[PDB]
């Protein structure tokens, strides 16, 4: 399972923070749900008592 | 004759899935015969660390212990579905009019 | 559109259907000449200065 998926790389910019001195990745998902009647996942709905 | 024109539109916001940094949290794996596949899984193998005892004190036995971790299936589809005039105009190619 | 995992139905038809019109609005501007002005303009006397 670990060996696939080497050799080639690429970069690819993208904005990062650090915490911790861990560096954790950033993202924007709106841009795959725009355009489209399906809710986004990231949202949901929490019911309270 | 004269034709009532239309207008078609093209353009889309393309994205792949690894362009985008969800991948970073998955390690993707292209196994062509997956359908084939029932449920894998992966045994994992885990000795306790021991510590040693004091004088009039239990004694801390060795006890080897053992997991192992499955996988869910996520089975997705989509159609596209084609005019039966569009489908049987693909096949047979006209020589009239331009 | 998008693919789902759901047993809920995604759309069979791809591109909807879109009417549009093209609303003109036109524009008008008089501006008024005096027959002297033009009656002068053509015309040449050649009398004096």
């Known amino acids: 399972l670990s060996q696939a998926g080497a050799h080639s790389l690429t970069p690819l910019s993208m904005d990062v923070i650090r915490l911790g001195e861990k560096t954790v990745i950033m993202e924007n998902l709106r841009r795959?749900?725009?355009?489209?009647?399906?809710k986004d996942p990231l949202e949901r709905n929490v019911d309270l008592t | 004759?004269?034709?009532?024109?239309?207008?078609?539109?093209?353009?889309?916001?393309?994205?792949?899935?690894?362009?985008?940094?969800?991948?970073?949290?998955?390690?993707?794996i292209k196994f062509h015969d997956l359908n084939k596949l029932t449920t894998g899984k992966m045994l994992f193998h885990?000795?306790?660390?021991?510590?040693?005892?004091?004088?009039?004190?239990?004694?801390?036995?060795?006890?080897?212990?053992?997991?192992?971790?499955?996988?869910?299936?996520?089975?997705?589809?989509?159609?596209?579905?084609l005019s039966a005039a569009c489908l049987t105009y693909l096949r047979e190619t006209f020589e009239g009019t331009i």
């Open chain 2, 1 to 28: 004759f004269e034709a009532i024109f239309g207008t078609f539109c093209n353009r889309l916001e393309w994205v792949y899935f690894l362009t985008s940094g969800l991948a970073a949290a998955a390690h993707a």
């Open chain 1, 32 to 38: 795959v749900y725009k355009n489209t009647d399906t």
């Open chain 2, 46 to 81: 885990v000795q306790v660390p021991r510590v040693a005892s004091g004088a009039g004190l239990p004694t801390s036995r060795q006890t080897t212990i053992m997991v192992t971790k499955y996988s869910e299936k996520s089975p997705i589809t989509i159609p596209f579905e």
